Paper text:
Members of GH family 73 (GH73) are β-N-acetylglucosaminidases that cleave the β-1,4 glycosidic linkage between the N-acetylglucosamine (GlcNAc) and N-acetylmuramic acid (MurNAc) residues of bacterial cell wall peptidoglycan (PG). In some instances, GH73 enzymes are associated with bacterial pathogenicity, for example, LytB being critical for pneumococcal nasal colonization and cell division, Auto for pathogenic listeriosis caused by Listeria monocytogenes, and FlgJ for biogenesis and function of the flagellum, which is a major virulence factor of motile pathogenic bacteria. The domain was found to adopt a lysozyme-like fold common to other GH73 enzymes, which consists of an α-helical subdomain packed against a β-lobe that forms an extended β-hairpin motif. The α-helical domain and β-hairpin of StFlgJGH(151–316) together form a groove-shaped active site, with the α-helical subdomain containing an α-central helix that houses a conserved glutamate general acid/base (E184), and the β-hairpin, in turn, containing a second glutamate residue (E223) previously determined to be required for GH activity.
To explore the structural basis of FlgJ activity, we determined the crystal structure of the FlgJ GH domain from S. typhimurium (StFlgJ) to 1.8 Å resolution. Interestingly, the active site of StFlgJGH(151–316) was found to be occupied by the C-terminal α-helix of a neighbouring symmetry mate. The C-terminal α-helix StFlgJGH(151–316) packs into the active site of the symmetry mate via hydrophobic and hydrogen-bonding interactions. Hydrophobic interactions were found to occur between L312 of the helix and F204 and Y249 of the active site of the symmetry mate, as well as between Y308 of the helix and L183 and Y286 of the symmetry mate active site. Hydrogen bonds occur between Y308 and N311 of the helix and K289 and backbone amide of Y280 of the symmetry mate active site. Residues 223–229—which form a loop connecting the two strands of the β-hairpin motif—were disordered and could not be modeled. Similar results have been reported for the crystal structures of other GH73 enzymes, indicating that the β-hairpin is likely mobile in this family of enzymes. A superposition of the StFlgJ and SpFlgJ GH domain structures with Auto reveals that the C- and N-termini of these enzymes are spatially conserved, which suggested that FlgJ might be auto-inhibited by the C-terminal α-helix, in similar fashion to the auto-inhibition of Auto by an N-terminal α-helix. To determine whether the C-terminus of StFlgJGH(151–316) autoinhibits the enzyme in solution, the full-length StFlgJ GH domain, StFlgJGH(151–316) and a C-terminal truncated form of the domain (StFlgJGH(151–301)) were tested for activity using a zymogram assay. Contrary to our hypothesis, we found the catalytic activity of StFlgJ to be unaffected by presence or absence of its C-terminal α-helix, suggesting the helix does not regulate function.
Numbering used by the authors: -1 to 71, 79 to 164
The structure:
Amino acid sequence: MDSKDFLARLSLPARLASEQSGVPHHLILAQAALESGWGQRQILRENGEPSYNVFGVKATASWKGPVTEITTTKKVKAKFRVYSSYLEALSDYVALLTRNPRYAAVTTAATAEQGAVALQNAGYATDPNYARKLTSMIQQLKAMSEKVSKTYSANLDNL
Ligand SMILES: [Cl-]
């Protein structure tokens, strides 16, 4: 979807997931934007409802919840976790991060930029383009959130 719409949908759940886990707010958002293509990747349930699974987290035997089966083209079938909300999805994502001791420094970073350093040290992605893209995403999100905040107060002084 449009970047502004994506940010509007995911900002609050990422903030709440950040409070729960310690993972920086805009790091979660940046990874979600980056990996879903600002929501262009949609993973729907069989009846068309959203799965809210923005990261594309696969359903395996360690998942107790609902799943959705996506078949892509040779033909290939994959199972994804189904969530009831973006908040549940991002909460599950930072829990998965939290569960892995190698990413401890991510859960104690004070800024998104520090969090991105921590991910890179932990070896989150081997392709060095991922860290470059994440750095740029974090910068873009900072500018966007500034712009939103000014739309709010610029508007309020209508009245
Ligand atoms: Cl995918």
